[PDB]
A paper describes a structure:
Ciliary motility is driven by a microtubule-based supramolecular assembly known as the axoneme, which consists of nine doublet microtubules (DMTs) surrounding a central apparatus of two singlet microtubules. DMTs are patterned into repeating 96-nm units by two rows of dynein arms (outer dynein arms (ODAs) and inner dynein arms (IDAs)), up to three T-shaped mechanoregulatory complexes called radial spokes (RSs), the nexin–dynein regulatory complex (N-DRC) that links neighbouring DMTs and a network of coiled coils that regulates the docking and periodicity of the aforementioned complexes. In addition, the DMT lumen is extensively decorated with microtubule inner proteins (MIPs) that bind in varying multiples of the 8-nm tubulin repeat, but with an overall periodicity of 48 nm that is in coherent register with the external 96-nm repeat. Here we use cryoelectron microscopy, cryoelectron tomography and proteomics to resolve the 96-nm modular repeat of axonemal doublet microtubules (DMTs) from both sperm flagella and epithelial cilia of the oviduct, brain ventricles and respiratory tract.
Author numbering:
A (entry chain LK): 1 to 38, 44 to 440
B (entry chain 3P): 2 to 33, 43 to 47
C (entry chain 1P): 2 to 119
D (entry chain KL): 1 to 429
E (entry chain 3L): 7 to 50
F (entry chain KK): 1 to 37, 47 to 439
G (entry chain LL): 1 to 426
The structure:
C-alpha cells in the first residue's frame, strides 16, 4: 500500500515534477517507456502502478493553464511514461493573477482535476496523503493551488495534504505583481493546508554556487535538489529503514499550532565531486551543516528566530548511535535557540538505502545523507519583508484593477492582509519565554 | 474455451412437445452425407 | 437507498477499505420491527396522496456544482484550542454562515473539536 | 429404501444442483457417464438415496430440473456432469421469468405444474420408501422464488407426512443482484414458513468472505460458491449414505432442531474449510473444527449470531473421531458462550458422528444453527418491502397480471409475525 | 562464521546496496490479503 | 429457441442496423452472404440451403438509404421479402408518417412480423430502432406499437430511440416530432433505452483520439450496446439475464420508461496499454457523468433503477466490491422507494472486436442501463422548444392539412406536462 | 500447560519482538521453516508456552502482530525468521498513527481493536491454562503508545486474573526521537499504572551506553540493541521453560517484587555481557557476574540506582552452579552497602536459577530490579510535559480527534502521585 498522489500545478510544479519523476524512475529501475527491465519488488506502488503488461504509470496529475510547459512532457523522453489524461492543460494562462487562478480560469479545470484525482485515489489501496508542488509567485501556482485545496478539503476532508511551495526570495524576484499573489495564496491556505515545506530560489543559488562547484546554476539544478528532498521524505516508506517516518507524522511533529505550518527544508550533504574527495561525511559532521545559516535553503537567518520543531531524516549507512550523539552536541551548543515549550525539538528518522545519483548530475556519491525539515520563528521576518512588498504596492492601490476587475471583490485585499498580519503576532507569541 | 464461449441451444420444441432439439450440438464452442471438395 | 450492514461482515466493506477515501456516506447499524401491514402512501403513477405530510427539500437532490459552490470555502479541520476567542468566533462564523454547503450531498462535513481560551 | 427426491428450480438452483450432483458423484464414485468406478465398497449400498439404477449398470440421479426457459439448462448439460440427468427430467417453458414472482407463480408457472408434478410422482412412486424432498432455488428471481415455492405447495398438499427440505439463497444485504428482489423474497418467505419443515438461509456475501478470509481465494467464481453449498448439502445427508457410530437423517435432525413449527430457518457452515498455503499452520483436530463451526465469520447467512441466541445447533461430524472430544467441545462452547445460547432449552447442540469423511480430508463437520438473529434477514427485507410498497414501486408488473395488493399485505403481516416470534423466544427466561 | 547468537555477533554485508521493501501485506477489493513473500530486501 | 425479432424504422434505424448486423454476423461467424464457413438462432434463421437469414425487418418509408443495403456487401444476406421500402418520405412530419403515407405501408409490415412470428418457438421480445426527430422515425414508429400491442399484448417490447440533442439539432421541426411520438408511445412501450447524438460526439472526442467522428462511429458504438444487451441469450454466463428481464427491473412506473445507456470501456488502441481495465475501475466509469452517453448529469438527479451487464473476464466478487464502492459515494444518490437499485448481468464471452473499428480488444466490458431523474430537465428543455413554437402557430399547416387534427397537439402537450409532474413527484420523500 | 500469549504493537515493538522470536527459536532449535532441528529433549518439552503444534511437527508461535501500517511488518516478514508467524495473526490498518496517542487509542485504533481481540480470543481458549500476556512497544510512539494501551485495557476487562507484562520503551533522557514524546508518554503511563501487573522500562540511551562502554561495539544497529532486550525477556521466562534448582515463574517474581499495587515499574539488565577483547581477561565465576548484576552502567533504563534505594530486586540465573556461592553473593551485596536498600525489608533480592544456560555461555543471569530511582524518569517526563502543556504546544493534534483537556490533567496527576509514592520510600 502506502500510495501517494502528487499534484504539480504551474510551470514551477511541472519543472520540479520533471526532476522529481526522473529520480523516482532511477530509484526503482523504471525505464522512460514505463517498463522495468526485470511478483518481485513492489516498492514502486507508492509512486507508480501496474497495468498487467509490465507498464508502470505514475500516480501523479499535471495541471497547468499554459500549454507550452506540459507539451514538452508529451513530446519528450518521458512521453510514454505519463498517462495522457494525467497531463492537463488549459487554453490561457493565469497571467500572474490569483483571481484568474481562483475565480475565472482556475474554476475551469478544477472539476476535471478533481475527477482525475478521484480516479487516481480509486486505485490506491492505502493512501498516505497528497503532495502538491507549486510556487507562491505564479498565477496558477498560487490561484489554482488555492482553489484545489478548498475542494480537497470539501471532498477529502482531513486527508493529509502537504505542499512544496517556492517562496518568493526576499531580494531576488521574477514578477512584479508577485507579492500580491503571495499574500492571497497564503490567506486561503492557512485553514486548508496541513503542512507546507518551503524553499526559495536565491538560497539554492548560493548553495549551488558555493557548496557545488557549478557557476551560474540553472532551474534544472534547483529542481533536482528539491527532487532529492521529496525523495528523501518519502523513501522511509519506500525502503527499509531503522526509524520509519510516514507522511502523516510530519504534520504532528512540525505543526504545533493550527495557523503556523511553514517549516523550512534543507539538504546538507550537497557537495561537488572535486570537494567530496577531501572531506569525510560522518553523521555528526553532516548534521551540523543542517544547522548552518549559510546552508539553509530558505534565505533567512535561523539565529534571528528560535527553533520550534525539527524533523531529521537520515538516508544511508547512518548508525543510530552516531545520530544520537550528534543531536546531543547540538543541544549543548548555545548559538541555536529552542523555545521553552518544546524541550524535545527533534524527530529523527533513519533509512538504510543510500541516495542514488542521477547519472551525470551535480550531486556526489554520498554514502549517507540527511534532510532537515525545521519550523523556525525566523520565518516571521520573511513575512515582515513580504508585508513590506504587498503593502508598499497597496497604499496606492497599484495593480488591483487586474484583480478587482475580474471576479474578485476589492474587500478580499481588505481581509487577506489583516488575517496574515495576525501571523506576525502569532510568531511573536510563540517566541516569548514564559516567566 | 478461451476466446469462444458460444452457448448452443440444445433444447427446444417441435410439434408442440418438450425435447432435446439438437442431439448433436457443440457445447461452449467445442464438442461434448458425402464429403465434396 | 440505505447502505445496510451485514453485521459480522461490515468491516471488509467499510468505505476506506473499498478504496473510497472521500467522506463516504454512513451505513445503517440497527433496524426496528414493524407489527403488521404498511399503508399505501402514494397512488398509481407515483403521486403522493394529498393527506400525507410532504418533505421540504429539492426533489432532484443537493449536488453543489463547481460554480454554485460558495467562495471562501471553510475548512474541515476546525479545532479551536490554542486559538483566541475572536479567532475561534471567526472560524465558527465562517462555517456557520454557509448553511447551503453544510446540507449538500457533496458538502463539507466539519469537525469543530476544541474549546478556546477564556 | 430411504431415498429423497431432488428439486432444481430457477437458474440459481440449476448451477447449485449441477455442482451438487458433481460433488455427490465424485463422493459416490459415479463417473460423468453414469457407471461406477469407486474404490471402496461403502459407496454402493446407499446409492439409492440419490440415484436410480438403469439397465446397463448406470445410475441415474433422482432429480428434476424445472425452469421457465431452457436457457440455463443449455449450460447445465454443456457442463461436465450434464449427461447424467434424464432428458425427461428437464422441464422448460417458453418465455422467461423477468424476476417476477407473478410469472413464476400465477401466469407462466401454472402451465408447467402438471408436467413437473407428473415427473415428481413417477420418481416418488418408484421409491420403496421415500424419505423427503430437497430443493435448491433463490429468493430473488422469478422461477426459483415463484415456481419453486409453488412446487413446495403442491408437493406438501399431496405428501403431508413427508418432510420438505429446501436450500434457499436469500437476497444480499448490501449489493442487490435484482432491483425487484424484496418483493420476491417476501412472497417466498410467506409460503416457505407455512409449507416447509427445513430451510437453509444461504447468502452470497457470507460465501464471498469465506472465500477470501478463510479460503484465501484470489479469484473466486460461482463454481467455488456452489461447491461450498454442495459440501453443506452432502454433509446433512451423510448418515443416510454412510454408516456411523452416531447417525441422524434429516427427520431425526429436524425433530430436535425446530422447537415450534414456524421456527425452521437455519444457518449453514462448514468446519474444515482452510486455505491452500496455510494447511501446515493449523492442526486438524476436534477443537479446531468446533471453533471454526462456532466462529461467527464462518456462517453462510450473513447474519451475526452474536446479535441473537442459538435456539438449537446441529453438528453432523464426519470422520473417525473420539466421542469424548466431540462431547466435551460442544459442552465448552455452550458453557464458554452462555449469553448466545438460550436458557429454556438445556442442551442446544445435536451431535451426529459418521465414519466416512469427504474425500481428500481426514475430519469434517456440518453446522446448522437456528439462531434468533436470522430475524435480521427478515427485518431487512421487511424494511425494503415497506419502502417499495409504501410508494408503489414496481407493483404494476405484479398487480397487472392477477395478484391483488392483499397478497402483498398478508405477506407483510405473516413475515412480521415471524420476527415477533423470534424476538419472543430470545428475551424469554 | 558459526558464532553463537549473541549481541556482539551481528555483522552486516556492506556490498549490498539496494534496500527495497516489498509489500506482501496489502488490500484487495475489501480484504486484508497477506501474500507469500517471494523476494527480500533489495529485490534478491 | 430464445428467438428475438429486431425492427428498424427510419433512416436512423437502417444506418444503425447496418453496423449492428455487421457486428452480429461477425460475432457468430456469419459471412456476409448468409453462409457459415446453434447460438445464431436468436437473430439468424437457418434456411434449408445453408444460408442464415437475419430475424429482422428493415422498414423505412424512404427508398434511398435502403438501396445502400440492396447494393452493398450485405446484399445476399438480407431477405428481399423481409426488407420493406417506401415510395415517398414522411418529410419530417409526424402526420405523414402516421396518417397519410404510413398507413399504406404498415399493412404489409405486420404480415412480415406474422411470418416472422411463426418461425420462432419462443419469442423473447421485440427490438425497435428509431429516432425522435424524423417523420417516419416518429410517425411510423407510433403505428408499430399501436398495432403490435393489439396483435401480441403481453409479449415483451423493448425499443431504442435517438433522443434529440440538447444543444445541436439536425432540423427545426424536431420538437414537434418528439413530443407527438412520446404522447402515444408512453402507454404502448415496455421500456425505451435512450441514446443521444451530441453526447457520443463528446464520447468520441475525449475517450478516443479520433476527432471529427461521422455517423458510422456512432452506429458502431450503439451496436456494441445492443450486442451487450442480448449477449446473455447466446453465450454462457455466470448469472444469465433475459430480454424480458429488462422491463420489470428498470421501469418503476408505466409513465417512466426512459432509462439511459452507458458503455464504459470506450477506449482506443493506444490507451489500453496505459491503464488496467479491471471491473472496479470500469464500473466507477459507468457512473462518471463524462462517460455517459446522454447529456445530463445524474448528480443533479436521483437513481431509481440501474442495470449492469458485464461480459468478459470478470469476477463476481469484483463486481460486488465495485457496486458497494459506488453505494458509498456521495456523488450517487438514490430515491427513498428503491433500496435495491441494482441488478447484475455477467457473461463469460468477451466482446468481439470489429476490424476497421476504433475500440480495442478488451478482456472485459460493461454496459450500464439506468433510469434517472436527471432526464426531467431534458424533457423540460424539449417542451420549452415546443412551447416557443406552438405559441404562435408555426409549421402546423404542414401537420393539420395532412390528415391530422390540430387538437392532438394539445393533448400531447397536456400529457407531457404531467410527465414532468411525474418526475418531481417521484423524487420527493416522506 | 503454562502458556503465554505474546502480543506486540508499533514499529518499536515489532522490531524488538522479531528479535525476541529469533532468540527463542535459537534456544528452542526452531528453524526458519519452523521445524525442530535441535539436540536435546530439554529443548522440546516446554515448547507450548510460546509455540503451538501444527501438522507435521511444525511450531507456529503464539504472537499477535498489531500495527496501523504494515511497513514494519513487511520489513519483519522479509527477514530470516519472518515466515514462522501465521498470516492470520497479521492484523494491520490502512492509515498511519501519526505519532498521535489520540489516533492510536480513540479514533483510528477503534477500527482495529475488534480484529485484534478476535485473534487474542483465538489464542486464549486454544490452550489449557493461559499463564498470561506480554506486550512490547514504545511509549513515545503513536500506535505502540496509543493502541498498545487500548489493547491492554481490552485484555484486562476480559482476563483480569492473569498476569500481563509490558516491555515498554520509555523516552530517552537527553535526546528525543519524536517531538511529541512527553504527550504520548504521559498518556500511556496513566494507562500503564492501573492496567499492568509488571512493567519493564527500557530506553535507548542505556542500551547505547551498554553497547559502547561495555560491549566495545563500534557500529551498534537496532538488531543488537533489541538483542539486549530479547535476552532479558528470555531470562524472566526461563524457569517457565527449562528445569532448575529453584524455579520462579512470572507471578512468583511479581508477588515479592510488587510491595504495593502501584509500584510495578522495574529496571532490566543482563550480567554476562562482556567486552570485545576482554573475554580472556574474564574469570568465569559467580562473583564477577554478581558485581555486573548491580553495576550501574549495566542498567537498561539510564536511571542511576545510587540516587535511589532498591525496593525489591529479582535475580534469575542460568547454568549449573552451587547455591551457597549465589546466596553468599546476594547477602554480601545487601550488607556491604545497605544505604541503597530499604531498611524495612530484610531481604530485597530473590534468587532464581536454571540448569540450562543459553548456547555459547557457561553461566548466565538476568537482572530485574524495582528501585526508588525510577521516579526521576517520571519527573523528567513530567517537567517536559508541563512545559508543553502550559503553552498548549501540540494539543490541537490531540483535541482534534475528540479528546478533552481533562484527560491530560488527569494523566499528569497520576504520574505525580506515582512520583510521590516512590518518594515516600526513600
Ligand atoms: N526553484 C524553482 N523555482 C521555479 C522554477 N520554475 C519557476 N519557478 C518559480 O515560479 C515562479 C513563477 O511561477 P510559475 O510556476 O513558473 O508560473 P505559473 O504558476 O504557471 O503562473 P502563471 O503562468 O502566471 O499562470 C517564479 O518566480 C520562480 O521563482 C524552477 O524550475 N525551480
Ligand atoms: N447515431 C446515428 N444517428 C443517426 C444516423 N442516421 C440518422 N440518425 C439520426 O436521425 C437524424 C436524421 O433524421 P431521421 O430521424 O433519421 O429521419 P427519419 O427517421 O428517416 O424520418 P424522415 O426521413 O423524416 O422520414 C439525425 O439527426 C440523427 O440524429 C446514424 O447513422 N447514426
Ligand atoms: N450461489 C449461486 N447463486 C446464484 C447463481 N446464479 C444466480 N444466483 C443468485 O440468484 C439470484 C438471482 O436469482 P435469479 O437468477 O433471477 O433466479 P431465477 O429467476 O429463478 O432464474 C442472485 O441474487 C444470485 O446471487 C449461482 O450460480 N450460484
Ligand atoms: N530498542 C529499540 N527501540 C526502537 C526500535 N525501533 C524504534 N525504537 C524506538 O521507538 C521510538 C519510535 O517509536 P515508533 O515505534 O516509531 O512509534 P510508532 O510508529 O507509533 O510505532 C524511538 O524513540 C526509538 O528509539 C528498535 O528496534 N529497538
Ligand atoms: Mg506559466
Ligand atoms: Mg429519410
Amino acid at each position: 500500500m502506502r500510495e501517494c498522489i502528487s499534484v504539480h500545478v504551474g510551470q514551477a510544479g511541472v519543472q520540479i515534477g520533471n526532476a522529481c519523476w526522473e529520480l523516482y524512475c532511477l530509484e526503482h529501475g523504471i525505464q522512460p517507456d514505463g517498463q522495468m527491465p526485470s511478483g518481485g519488488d513492489d516498492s514502486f506502488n507508492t509512486f507508480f502502478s501496474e497495468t498487467g503488461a509490465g507498464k508502470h504509470v505514475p500516480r501523479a496529475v499535471f495541471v497547468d493553464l499554459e500549454p507550452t510547459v506540459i507539451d514538452e512532457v508529451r513530446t519528450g523522453t518521458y512521453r510514454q511514461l505519463f498517462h495522457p489524461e494525467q497531463l492537463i492543460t488549459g487554453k490561457e494562462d493565469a497571467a500572474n493573477n490569483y483571481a484568474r487562478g481562483h475565480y475565472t480560469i482556475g474554476k475551469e479545470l478544477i472539476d476535471l482535476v478533481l475527477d482525475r484525482i478521484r480516479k487516481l485515489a480509486d486505485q490506491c489501496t492505502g493512501l498516505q496523503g497528497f503532495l502538491i508542488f507549486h510556487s507562491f509567485g505564479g498565477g496558477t501556482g498560487s490561484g489554482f493551488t488555492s482553489l484545489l485545496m478548498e475542494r480537497l478539503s470539501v471532498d477529502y476532508g482531513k486527508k493529509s495534504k502537504l505542499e512544496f511551495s517556492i517562496y518568493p526570495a526576499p531580494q531576488v524576484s521574477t514578477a512584479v505583481v508577485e507579492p500580491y499573489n503571495s499574500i492571497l495564496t497564503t490567506h486561503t491556505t492557512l485553514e486548508h493546508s496541513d503542512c507546507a515545506f518551503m524553499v526559495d530560489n536565491e538560497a539554492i543559488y548560493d548553495i549551488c554556487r558555493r557548496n557545488l562547484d557549478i557557476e551560474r546554476p540553472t532551474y534544472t539544478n534547483l529542481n533536482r535538489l528539491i527532487g532529492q528532498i521529496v525523495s528523501s521524505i518519502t523513501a522511509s516508506l519506500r525502503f527499509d529503514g531503522a526509524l520509519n517516518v510516514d507522511l502523516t507524522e510530519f504534520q504532528t511533529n512540525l505543526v504545533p499550532y493550527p495557523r503556523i505550518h511553514f517549516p523550512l527544508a534543507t539538504y546538507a550533504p550537497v557537495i561537488s565531486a572535486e570537494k567530496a574527495y577531501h572531506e569525510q561525511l560522518s553523521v555528526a559532521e553532516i548534521t551540523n551543516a543542517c544547522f548552518e545559516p549559510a546552508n539553509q535553503m530558505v534565505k533567512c537567518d535561523p539565529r534571528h528566530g528560535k527553533y520550534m520543531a525539527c524533523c531529521l531524516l537520515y538516508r544511508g549507512d547512518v548508525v543510530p548511535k552516531d545520530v544520537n550523539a550528534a543531536i546531543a552536541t547540538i543541544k549543548t551548543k548555545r548559538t541555536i535557540q529552542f523555545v521553552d515549550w518544546c524541550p524535545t525539538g527533534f524527530k529523527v528518522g533513519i533509512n538504510y538505502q543510500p541516495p542514488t545519483v542521477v547519472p551525470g548530475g551535480d550531486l556526489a556519491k554520498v554514502q549517507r545523507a540527511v534532510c532537515m525539515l525545521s519550523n523556525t520563528t525566523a520565518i516571521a521576518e520573511a513575512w515582515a519583508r513580504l508585508d513590506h512588498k504587498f503593502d508598499l504596492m497597496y497604499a496606492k492601490r497599484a495593480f488591483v484593477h487586474w484583480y478587482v476587475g475580474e471576479g474578485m471583490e476589492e474587500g478580499e485585499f481588505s481581509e487577506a492582509r489583516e488575517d496574515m498580519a495576525a501571523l506576525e503576532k502569532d510568531y511573536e507569541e510563540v517566541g516569548m519565554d514564559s516567566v | 474455451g478461451k476466446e469462444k464461449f458460444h452457448k448452443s441451444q440444445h433444447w427446444g420444441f417441435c410439434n408442440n412437445v418438450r425435447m432435446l432439439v439438437g442431439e448433436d450440438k457443440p457445447g461452449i464452442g467445442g464438442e461434448l452425407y458425402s464429403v465434396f471438395p | 437507498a440505505t447502505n445496510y450492514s451485514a453485521n459480522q461482515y461490515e468491516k471488509p466493506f467499510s468505505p476506506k477499505y473499498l478504496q473510497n477515501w472521500s467522506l463516504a456516506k454512513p451505513t445503517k447499524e440497527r433496524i426496528s420491527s414493524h407489527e403488521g401491514y404498511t399503508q399505501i402512501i402514494a397512488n398509481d403513477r407515483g403521486h403522493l396522496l394529498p393527506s400525507v405530510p410532504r418533505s421540504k427539500a429539492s426533489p432532484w437532490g443537493s449536488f453543489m456544482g463547481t460554480w454554485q459552490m460558495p467562495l471562501k470555502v471553510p475548512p474541515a479541520r476546525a479545532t479551536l484550542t490554542s486559538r483566541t476567542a475572536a479567532g475561534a468566533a471567526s472560524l465558527t462564523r465562517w462555517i456557520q454562515k454557509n448553511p447551503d454547503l453544510l446540507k449538500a450531498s457533496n458538502g463539507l462535513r466539519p469537525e469543530i473539536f476544541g474549546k478556546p481560551h477564556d | 429404501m430411504r431415498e429423497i427426491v431432488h428439486l432444481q428450480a430457477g437458474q440459481c438452483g440449476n448451477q447449485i444442483g449441477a455442482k451438487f450432483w458433481e460433488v455427490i458423484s465424485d463422493e459416490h464414485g459415479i463417473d460423468p457417464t453414469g457407471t461406477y468406478h469407486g474404490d471402496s465398497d461403502l459407496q454402493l449400498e446407499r446409492i439409492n438415496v440419490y440415484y436410480n439404477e438403469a439397465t446397463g449398470g448406470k445410475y441415474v440421479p433422482r432429480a428434476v430440473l424445472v425452469d421457465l426457459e431452457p436457457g440455463t439448462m443449455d449450460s447445465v448439460r454443456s457442463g461436465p456432469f450434464g449427461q447424467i440427468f434424464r432428458p425427461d427430467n428437464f422441464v422448460f417453458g417458453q418465455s422467461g421469468a423477468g424476476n417476477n414472482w407473478a410469472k413464476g407463480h400465477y401466469t407462466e408457472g401454472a402451465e408447467l405444474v402438471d408436467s413437473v408434478l407428473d415427473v415428481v410422482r413417477k420418481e416418488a412412486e418408484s421409491c420403496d420408501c421415500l424419505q423427503g424432498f430437497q430443493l435448491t432455488h433463490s429468493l430473488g428471481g422469478g422461477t426459483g422464488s415463484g415456481m419453486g415455492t409453488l412446487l413446495i405447495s403442491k408437493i406438501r398438499e399431496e405428501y403431508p407426512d413427508r418432510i420438505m427440505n429446501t436450500f434457499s439463497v436469500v437476497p444480499s444485504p448490501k449489493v442487490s443482484d435484482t432491483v425487484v428482489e424484496p418483493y420476491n423474497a417476501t412472497l417466498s418467505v410467506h409460503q416457505l414458513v407455512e409449507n416447509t419443515d427445513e430451510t437453509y438461509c444461504i447468502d452470497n456475501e457470507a460465501l464471498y468472505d469465506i472465500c477470501f478470509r478463510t479460503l484465501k481465494l484470489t479469484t473466486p467464481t460461482y463454481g467455488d460458491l456452489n461447491h461450498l453449498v454442495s459440501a453443506t448439502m452432502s454433509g446433512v445427508t451423510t448418515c443416510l449414505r454412510f454408516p456411523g457410530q452416531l447417525n441422524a437423517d434429516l427427520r431425526k435432525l429436524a425433530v430436535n432442531m425446530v422447537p415450534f413449527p414456524r421456527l425452521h430457518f437455519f444457518m449453514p457452515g462448514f468446519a474444515p474449510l482452510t486455505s491452500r498455503g496455510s494447511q501446515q499452520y493449523r492442526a486438524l483436530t476436534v477443537p479446531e473444527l468446533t471453533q471454526q463451526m462456532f466462529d461467527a465469520k464462518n456462517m453462510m447467512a450473513a447474519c451475526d449470531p452474536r446479535h441473537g441466541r442459538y435456539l438449537t445447533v446441529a453438528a453432523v461430524f464426519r470422520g473417525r473421531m473420539s466421542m469424548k472430544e466431540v462431547d466435551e467441545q460442544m459442552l465448552n462452547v455452550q458453557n464458554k458462550n452462555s449469553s448466545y445460547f438460550v436458557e429454556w432449552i438445556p442442551n442446544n447442540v445435536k451431535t451426529a458422528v459418521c465414519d466416512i469423511p469427504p474425500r481428500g480430508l481426514k475430519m469434517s463437520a456440518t453446522f446448522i444453527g437456528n439462531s434468533t438473529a436470522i430475524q435480521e434477514l427478515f427485518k431487512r427485507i421487511s424494511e425494503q418491502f415497506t419502502a417499495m410498497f409504501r410508494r408503489k414501486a414496481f407493483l404494476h408488473w405484479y398487480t397487472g397480471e392477477g395478484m391483488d395488493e392483499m397478497e402483498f399485505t398478508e405477506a407483510e403481516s405473516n413475515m412480521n409475525d415471524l420476527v415477533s416470534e423470534y424476538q419472543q423466544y430470545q428475551d424469554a427466561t | 562464521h558459526g558464532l553463537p547468537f549473541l549481541p556482539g555477533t551481528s555483522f552486516k554485508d556492506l556490498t549490498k546496496t539496494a534496500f527495497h521493501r516489498s509489500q506482501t501485506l496489502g488490500y484487495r477489493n475489501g480484504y486484508a490479503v497477506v501474500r507469500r513473500p517471494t523476494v527480500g530486501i533489495g529485490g534478491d
